Amino acid sequence: KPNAATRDQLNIIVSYPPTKQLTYEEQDLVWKFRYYLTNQEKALTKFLKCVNWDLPQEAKQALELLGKWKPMDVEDSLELLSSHYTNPTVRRYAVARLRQADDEDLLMYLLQLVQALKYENFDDIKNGLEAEIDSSQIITSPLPNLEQDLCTFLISRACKNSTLANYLYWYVIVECEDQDTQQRDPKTHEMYLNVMRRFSQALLKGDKSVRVMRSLLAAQQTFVDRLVHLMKAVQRESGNRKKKNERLQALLGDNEKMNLSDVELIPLPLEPQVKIRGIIPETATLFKSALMPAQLFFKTEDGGKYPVIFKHGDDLRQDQLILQIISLMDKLLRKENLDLKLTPYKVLATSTKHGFMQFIQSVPVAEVLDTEGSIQNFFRKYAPSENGPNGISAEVMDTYVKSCAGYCVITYILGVGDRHLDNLLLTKTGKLFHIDFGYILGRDPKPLPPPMKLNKEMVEGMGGTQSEQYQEFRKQCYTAFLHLRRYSNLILNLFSLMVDANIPDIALEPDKTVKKVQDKFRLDLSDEEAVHYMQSLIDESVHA
Ligand SMILES: C[C@@H]1COC[C@@H](C)N1c1cc(=O)n2c(n1)N(Cc1ccc(Cl)s1)[C@H](C(F)(F)F)CC2
């Protein structure tokens, strides 16, 4: 039991980011008052970071306390599923606490949970079963407290929830198709195939509904396979954009050949809650871009049109991670009652070579300026209001201020590079948002880029630096920033699980990736120092 002075020193340690490396001096203090810290749920993660698991007595002593401790939070168990831990009892404990989460929260961490399998017992996975095997053909070729591992648990929940089933499927499918993994880590590629085999197996074993989930996934797999075959053809067609589009619509029209315009209701892999009847052949076109991506309009169950960007010949995993993080950041912000009107549009890689994107009706800021002159002109044209600020609907102005603040902070934390008016989009409802996340975590095609993604034209849109709207922008920025800092351990743990994913800007320096995010939070500052720090970044970016 420690004195009043020691307790403060322990508290400094317990409050540390999950990433920060514990000094020997710190390691010994935690090791000493380990029976004291038992009632501190947040200290358990700092305790298991002291232990040298290579030492049986130290490992054994550590596990006794793990049973005695105040049960860990769901957000903190993600720490135990990283590469830092190899102890089966620890990894089993993470899963045991992770089971406390509901499916909504699980989906939030699913991309990372799939990556965490890379640190699981590959043999234990293989035992669960009852180049040679093609992963894409597993589901399409059906054959006539601390007990569960990560693999068992995910599969278990995936069989009860169709939304999880879908993302579990496509996440694991993309891991299986990873060439770098096949080449450099064959035993990992072999694990993912076995995860996919265990999944197909568990679904086949299920009730009427679970057996249909498997056919649905096969239908989805088959549909994607045909859309790829159509894409390869369109990308190959000799001619101009008009020639390739006519080929695109011709093949989409040919339902007997291609089977893409009229299909039995199947969930959209991108967003499974949306079921689709097929693709409208006549509204399909390629974007001007040299990668030849297509704009395809899906026919939904209840009469809607769901536009997608389907890319073939590009890896969508970086963009996929960023949009799932923006979606998480938006969810925590909303949780803290701060809806900043963000566009966390869906992105799903259906392979390392292709994937889907949720298309949002929007206009690039560049176009807005080159057609209407200003953001305020655009807004007066589509949302005029006499009583409103600068002749614009207050709702639209409120949406504009909120989304600008939200994206300023989010793109600041994620170190989003290559920012230009062509990859900043506006909606007639006042929604501002970012697209194309090719450069993140401090990368940029140009050297020494600004830490904040602001400009003259963005502020002009609010009514300039002297407006009431400009004050509210600053207020929203530093409010959003304080909130996101409150979930720094959750964000940092999720990024901790992304180090061994083949995401270009993470692959570049895995060992230094999480510190890049950690440093943006400026956890060294108090919330008041943080609020002033955020104002300095905003002011400097605007004045420059
Ligand atoms: C899916 C999202 C959200 O909804 C709107 C849309 C902008 N979007 C994105 C995201 C994204 O990464 N890109 C694109 N559109 N277009 C860029 C543009 C497409 C349409 C424009 Cl207008 S500007 C091209 C691509 F063709 F290669 F994909 C370059 C990359």
Instruction: For residue 364, give the 3-state DSSP assignment.
Output: strand
Phi, psi of 433 (to 5 degrees): -155, 160
Cα separation, 290 vs 256, whole angstroms: 30
Cα–chain center distance at 124: 28
Residue 254 Cα to ligand 1 middle (Å): 27
User: Residue 300: enclosing H or E segment and its boundaries?
Assistant: strand 294-300
User: Is any atom of ligand 1 closer than 6 Å to the C-beta of 287?
Assistant: yes
- Side chain identity at 363, as an amino acid letter? V
Dist. CA 100–CA 122, nearest whole Å: 25
Q: What is the dihedral of CA 477, 322, 414, 430, to 10 degrees?
A: -30
φ, ψ of residue 454 in degrees (nearest 5): -115, 170
User: Are 299 and 266 a contacting pair, CB within 8 Å?
Assistant: no
- At residue 271, what are phi and psi to the nearest 5 degrees? -145, 85
Q: Does 436 contact ligand 1 (Cβ within 6 A)?
A: yes
CA 364 to ligand 1 centroid distance, Å? 10
Examine the domain organization and report whether 215 and 199 are in the same domain: no
Q: Domain check: are 447 and 493 in the same one?
A: yes
How far is the centre of ligand 1, averaged over its atoms, from the C-alpha of 389 (Å)?
30
Place of tokens 């698991």: 53
Phi, psi (5° rounding) for residue 36? -75, -50
Amino acid at 197: R
Cα–Cα dist 314/17, whole Å = 35
Residues 158 and 294 in one domain: no
Could you tell me the two tokens for 32? 């000493």
What string of DSSP letters covers 29-97?
A: HHHHTTTTGGG-TTTHHHHTTT--TTSHHHHHHHHHHHHHS----HHHHHHHTSTT---HHHHHHHHHH
Query: What is the distance between the alpha carbons of residues 51 and 46, in angstroms, rounded to a whole number?
Result: 10
If we measure between CA atoms, which residue out of 146, 46, 151, 18 comes closest to residue 88?
A: 146
Three-state DSSP state, 275: strand
* Ligand 1 pocket member 366 (CB < 6 A): no
- Span from the CA of 472 to the centroid of ligand 1 (angstroms): 29
> Which atom in ligand 1 lies closest to the alpha carbon of residue 425?
7
Measure 347 CA to ligand 1 centroid, in angstroms: 11
**Å from CA of 359 to ligand 1 middle:** 7
Quick one: CA dihedral 421, 426, 432, 434, positive or negative? negative
Amino acid at 177: E
Domain at 328, CATH number: 3.30.1010.10
Beta-bridged to residue 295, according to DSSP, are 285, 309
DSSP, collapsed to helix, strand or coil, labels residue 446 as: coil
Q: 423: CA distance to ligand 1 center in Å?
A: 8
Across 353-452, the runs of DSSP E, i.e. the strands, are 354-358, 363-364, 424-426, 432-434
Q: Long-range contacts: 16-24, Cβ < 8 Å, 24+?
A: 16/46, 17/488, 17/489, 17/492, 17/518, 17/523, 18/45, 18/79, 18/489, 18/492, 18/493, 18/496, 19/492, 19/496, 19/514, 19/515, 19/518, 20/518, 22/46, 22/49, 22/50
Same domain, 182 and 253: no
- Residue 240: CB atoms within 10 Å: 9
- Which residue out of 241, 244, 245, 287 has the highest number of ligand 1 atoms within 8 Å of its CB and is therefore the one to mutate? 287
Determine whether 36 is exposed, middle or buried from the number of CB atoms within 10 Å of its CB (0-12, 13-18, 19+). middle
Structure tokens at 526: 């108090």
Bridge partners of residue 356, in order along the sequence: 310, 348
Torsions phi, psi for 384 (to 5 deg): -75, 145
Tokens 């206009």 belong to 363
Give the CATH number, domain containing residue 55.
Answer: 1.25.40.70
- Longest CA–CA span in the chain (Å) reads 80
Strand partners, 312: 354
Q: Tell whether 336 and 404 lie within a shared domain.
A: no
C-alpha dihedral, 210 to 96 to 94 to 499, nearest 10°: 10
Q: How far apart are CA 158 and CA 161, in angstroms?
A: 5
Contact, 270 vs 348, CB < 8 A? Answer: yes
SS3 letters across 42-57? CCHHHHCCCCCCCCHH
The number of the ligand 1 atom at minimal distance from the alpha carbon of 437 is 12
Same domain, 234 and 325: yes
CA–CA gap between residue 275 and residue 216 (Å, rounded): 11
Query: DSSP secondary-structure letter at 488?
Result: H
Instruction: For residue 487, give its domain range.
Output: 362-544
Give dist(CA 124, CA 113) in Å, integer: 17
- The number of the ligand 1 atom at minimal distance from the alpha carbon of 287 is 26
Which H or E element spans position 297?
strand 294-300
Work out the burial of residue 141: count CB atoms within 10 Å of its CB; fewer than 13 is exposed, 13-18 middle, 19 or more buried. exposed
Q: Are 397 and 469 in contact (CB under 8 A)?
A: yes
Q: Final residue of a domain: which of 344, 361, 378?
A: 361
Per-residue b/e over 430-445, b at no fewer than 16 CB within 10 Å?
bbbbbbebbbbbbbbe
172/259 same-domain check: no
Mutual orientation of helices 513-520 and 488-496 as an angle, nearest 10°?
Answer: 170
Look at the chain and report how many structural domains it folds into: 3
Q: Do 304 and 412 reside in the same domain of the chain?
A: no
Q: Given in angstroms, what resolution was this structure solved at? A: 2.8
Cα within 13 Å of Cα(376), Cβ side: 14
Q: Are 35 and 183 contained in the same domain?
A: yes
Q: In angstroms, what CA-CA distances link 474 with 88, 140, 417, 469, 477?
A: 47, 53, 22, 9, 5
Is 380 in the same domain as 458?
Answer: yes
Which helix (H) or strand (E) covers residue 279, if one does?
strand 271-279
Structure tokens at 296: 């395809």
Q: Which two tokens stand for residue 77?
A: 């168990």
Ligand 1 atom with the smallest distance to the CA of 288 is 26
CATH number for the domain that contains residue 391: 1.10.1070.11
Q: Which two tokens stand for residue 76?
A: 């903190």
State how far the Cα of 374 lies from the Cα of 417, in Å rounded to an integer.
24
Length of the chain: 544
Under a CB-based contact definition with an 8 Å cutoff, are residues 444 and 417 in contact? yes
CB-based contacts of 7, cutoff 8 Å, min separation 6: none
Q: How many CA atoms does the CB half-sphere of 433 hold within 13 Å?
A: 24
Q: Which protein residue's CA is at the shortest distance from atom 6 of ligand 1?
A: 359
Do 143 and 286 lie in a common domain?
Answer: no
Look up residue 141 and give its DSSP letter.
Answer: S
Q: How far apart are the first and last CA of the chain?
A: 55
Q: Which of 327, 342, 361 is the last residue of a domain?
A: 361
Structural domain ending residue among the three candidates 189, 207, 225: 207
Which ligand 1 atom sits nearest the alpha carbon of residue 314?
27
Q: CA 214, CA 473: separation in Å to the nearest integer?
A: 48
- Tell the burial category of 25 from Cβ atoms under 10 Å away from its Cβ (0-12, 13-18, 19+): exposed
Answer yes or no: are the C-beta atoms of 269 and 356 closer than 8 Å. yes
- Judge if 193 and 294 occupy the same domain: no
Pocket test for ligand 1, best of 342, 357, 403, 432 (most atoms within 8 A of CB): 357
Strands 432-434 and 294-300: unpaired
Residue 449 in tokens: 């880029």
> How many C-beta atoms lie closer than 10 Å to residue 8's C-beta?
10
- Provide the 10 A C-beta neighbour count for residue 397: 25
The residue assigned the tokens 């000799």 is 238
Residue 390 vs residues 265, 455, 468: alpha-carbon distances, Å: 47, 19, 12
Residue located nearest, by CA, to atom 1 of ligand 1: 359
* Any atom of ligand 1 within 6 Å of the Cβ of 362: yes
Three-state DSSP class for 238? Answer: coil
Query: Which has the closest alpha carbon to 431: 325, 541, 345, 308?
Result: 345
Q: Is 75 in the pocket of ligand 1 (CB under 6 A)?
A: no
